[PDB]
Symmetry: C5
C-alpha cells in the first residue's frame, strides 16, 4: 500500500520533472538560436558601418 | 499511519509549490519568447531605417 | 524520526530559492520594460 | 538503520543542492552586473542623440 | 528490497539531476561568453562613433 503509493507518487514526480526538463532544453536551444541571430545582426551592421 | 499521512501531506504541499513555480517559469518563458520576437521586430525597423 | 525536520529544512531552502527566482523575474521584467523604453526613445529621435 | 542511511543520503543531496544554489546566486550577481553595464552604455549612446 | 528499490531509484534520480546541473552550467558558460562578445561589440561601436 504505502511503498506502492510512494512508488506511484515518485513516478508522477519524475514525469513532471521530465516535462519541465524538456521545456528548459527547448528554451536553451531557443536562447542559442537567438544568440546566433544576435551575432549575425552585429556583423550586418559592422559591414554597413565600415 | 500518522507519520505516513504527515509525509503524504508534506509531499502534496511541496508538489503544489513546485507546480506554482513551474507555472511561473512557463509565464517567464512566454515573456522571453515575446521579447525575442520584439527584438527581431526592432532589428527590422533599424534595418529599414538604414535602407 | 529525523525525516520530518530534515524535510522542513530543505523546504525552507526551496522556498527561499523560489523567492530569489521571483526577485530575478521581477528584475528581468523591469529590464525588458527599460529595453522597450530605450527603443521607443531612439525611434522618437530617429524617425 | 534504513532511516540512518537515508539520513546520510539526504545530507549528500543537500550539499549538492547547495552547490547548485551557490552557482545560481553567482549567475544572478553576474546578470545584475550586466544589467548595470547595459544601462550605462544606453546612457552613453544617449549622448549621440 | 523495496528499500533497495528506493536506493536504486534515488541514485537514478541523482544521475538525471546531475545531467541537468551540467547542462545549466554549460548554459551559464555560454551566457558569460555571450556577455564578453556583447562587451566587445559595445567597444567596437564606441570607436566607430569617435
Amino acid at each position: 500500500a504505502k511503498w506502492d503509493q510512494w512508488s506511484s507518487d515518485w513516478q508522477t514526480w519524475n514525469a513532471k520533472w521530465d516535462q519541465w526538463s524538456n521545456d528548459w532544453n527547448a528554451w536553451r536551444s531557443d536562447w542559442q538560436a537567438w544568440k546566433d541571430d544576435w551575432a549575425r545582426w552585429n556583423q550586418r551592421w559592422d559591414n554597413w558601418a565600415t
